[model samples]
Target: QEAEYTLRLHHFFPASAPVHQEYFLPWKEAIEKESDGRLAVELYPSMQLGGTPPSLYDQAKDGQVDIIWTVLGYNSGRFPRAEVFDLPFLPTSGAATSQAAHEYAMTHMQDELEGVYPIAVHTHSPGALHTKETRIEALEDIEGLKMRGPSRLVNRYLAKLGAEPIGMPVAQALEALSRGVLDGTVIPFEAITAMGLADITTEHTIFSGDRALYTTMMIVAMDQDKYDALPEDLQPIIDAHAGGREAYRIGQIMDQADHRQILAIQSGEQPGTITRLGSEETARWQAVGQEVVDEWIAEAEEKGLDGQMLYDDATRLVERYTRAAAL
Candidate 1:
């Protein structure tokens, strides 16, 4: 069968990563199968197609690539409404939060992502603190340590907790950790083994509660023109694999990988030590995190956007999804 259209899907993770294997590959199969060989997807992982990770959205928007899956926060200050998901202690389970993010984006982030047709917007499992040599047993232990964060809000949250926050792409973290350029990084368990982060980070700090420390938003988008050019009959195939439920599946895949990686760590198959913070200690951090939330609301208000409303909606969706998923 001859392919009528081929989509060059670009992303930052390596081909070995779960996002590539579990998410992208499966989506590729579905798209090809559903379209009956009319739509072919060619994946370029690890910036293989060229340009940095941060440039991925533009690559798609400029029609340099047919599709891209990139972090929304990589272009900080551009997607304030979507940042609600990135606020400290706001995200719980990966699957639930990701579904919420997708639902939230459908309503809140359309303008922010102008020029691109969003296929899905989602997040990873709640981010945990992974350290090279320091064991963060208390909030004060974060002081003076240099940590990598993916976005502005997350960097601010790190600063509030006393860590010197460094903003960089995850692709750069492994070398930074290995070279002692970074003291630690904020990432999820699923990324540990995939990015070789487990080898350099020995201590993992986790919080105890329904809320997680943090998470970053990711979007699978296509060039608006490319999407518009799709054959009307073939468009449904793309639409079928897109949207909120599909985003939920990506998050679920990430959560499963997180669970497996954590189990590996516990069984000594992976290199890392888990330090789960007690409720009392976790509460202290949560209090500080509230301050970050307040600051974001204030900033949003100053910009004439309803910060509180967006935050409330995001949390409400999170709750709804969490409860719905529990059943």
Candidate 2:
């Protein structure tokens, strides 16, 4: 019940963020309990070890940190195969796509995303256009506005639609919106509250129907040397807690945080206009989604595997999970 290894988990978010409360803290507690206090994990929030958001993955890879909870988009184009999950209209629910993401990574990107041993890959639920000025109830509304795109892929979508897409880590999103560095940003419900979007922005355009406008991906990766250096018996403990289903479980927890923010906004305590574009208007956005998919295909072509082939398989995997769980 006493000492073996201590893992330092690092990320660029406050301790109050739901990801910390619902996922990271509970995760290590379970690991410690199962290990009978043998392996202890310490969480360092807000990049306490002193690097910016984009540098988080390298912090883990270089052994500056043992584990990193960071977004894949921070190092864009590194995980080339991830285009399958990042494209528009392909994701229904974060939980399902998140499960599909880890599996797809395991199946297709074993070596491409090396250096760190991947613990999990997750998709945040579909996000909406939340803005300080213009509301995005229709496709034309996005044109000419400078919006924060979570990843290069999302930026491509924004750019193609005649909107000016700015790529920045969400860590700076609130500040950007407040000072008018950006007109709006594509943010999910869970993150909108975490980023304080309701207070920063006056309007949030929600996608009324099944699919969200766009989504972003996150990862919980471990330092390869750190994982391999663990007590031999403890390897099983880490395995039991890592990978695809773990990503899905994390998404499920984030889903709760998302609903909490939704409830606050719906109840009117949160300041913002919640605009639903309705099912009829939702169809109007499909053309934009198609162009984004085309953009992904072109990007995927640069990555080698047939784009359509990768997409079709990824779709089936998302369908597999979403079918059982309800879009």
Candidate 3:
């Protein structure tokens, strides 16, 4: 009976994306091999099964699909509790944030993800601004520019900095750029190449160092029924892969590698301008970020959740991971 059923995995990313080629695909292969082919996974990339990117979570929740890898922020206000990690300057490395996210979910937000089996909740490398118009050297430069944001929190950050935020699925960004719907967009370098964005925009701006302005959250989930129905013996295979800190490490490594590839490609081409804010600018940005933190705390408290505690824990975890990585 186990061999007769195949799990269908769906996501909004293109097959060419590094997360797909380097991470998701390999993860699937590992699952199959570990299961001895008794269980299998079929991937539907580019939303091939149907519906827009935002609908992916619901698809998995409602059993319209067996599994899904999607953005947790796609549903917007529905998952406001998880937006703390999505805030500006939260964490620059995906793995660090991912591990932190998993811990946070296990302790705090499990109920938010109850509709589906959450295999992992991760974040990407810090996002940067790439534009056709001007290099963003300071906060002032962001004024009046229409930028593409990956999540609602990032959009809020951009808006606070005076940039007009245009919300679109990452898949549709290239078209938006080509049609002049946006002046530029904020995304990790890994996504630029995968989405053909690098070909369209020649100028890229990165922060001066390893710091990320903001990050996006990623989720790999399975239909609750599908996971529940798995043969008890085979369930550990999936559990082993996704359980504890290992899943976050796996996802983070893949994401870091993806960013490295993007950086390499960007280096070979017309080198994009990289800028770090001056001390004054950094201070101003930090102030703005603090406001977001305060707002999140108040909002979470209203819901009977301890936003300050979660924020503190996430900050500490990210610092711990970053220090370890430097070694």
Tens digit of per-residue lDDT, candidate 2, span 277-316: 8887877676777887876777678867688777778878
Per TM-score, what order, best first?
1, 2, 3
**TM-score of model 1 relative to the true fold?**
0.93
Among all candidates shown, the one with the greatest TM-score: 1
What clash pairs does model 3 have?
Answer: none
Q: Model 1 clash pairs?
A: none
Q: Is candidate 1 or candidate 3 better by lDDT?
A: 1
TM-score of each: 0.93, 0.92, 0.87
Q: How close to the true structure is residue 107 of candidate 1, measured as C-alpha lDDT? A: 91
Candidate 2 off by > 4 Å: 168-172, 179-181
lDDT of 1 by residue, 191-278 (tens): 7667777778989999898899989899999998899999999989989999988888888888888888888889999777899999
lDDT of each: 0.88, 0.81, 0.76
Name the candidate, 2 or 3, with the larger TM-score value: 2
lDDT of 1 at 54: 75
Candidate 3's displacement at residue 78, Å, is: 1.3
Q: How many pairs in model 1 have backbone atoms within 3 A of each other, for residues 3 or more apart or on separate chains, i.e. clashes?
A: 0
In candidate 2 the C-alpha lDDT for residue 173 amounts to: 85
